[PDB]
Amino acid sequence: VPIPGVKQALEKKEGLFRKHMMGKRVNYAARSVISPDPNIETNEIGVPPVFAVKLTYPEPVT
């Protein structure tokens, strides 16, 4: 009910250790509902074209 202090910002879950150090939000990650697919090599993941257009990898030119 009162304004949280510095201690109240670190102590419990939703604090600063458990919510922004041990678990963080990340870049270059997608989330989606899965569907089954045979004709996939059982070590592969079938990605949509949208994810293939957004997600990128920095390849140094050689």
Partner 1 sequence: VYRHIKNRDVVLMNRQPTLHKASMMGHKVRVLPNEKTLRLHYANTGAYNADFDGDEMNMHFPQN
The binding site for partner 1 (CB under 8 A) comprises: 26, 28-38, 40-53, 55-59, 61
Query: Residue 22 or residue 41: which is nearer to partner 1 going by CB?
Result: 41
d(CA 52, CA 59): 15
Query: Minimum distance from CB of 21 to partner 1 (Å)?
Result: 18
Query: Residue 4 or residue 42: which is nearer to partner 1 going by CB?
Result: 42
CA atoms within 13 A on the CB side of 34: 5
Tokens standing for residue 14: 């939703």
Query: Residue 2 or residue 49: which is nearer to partner 1 going by CB?
Result: 49
The DSSP secondary-structure symbol of 2 reads P
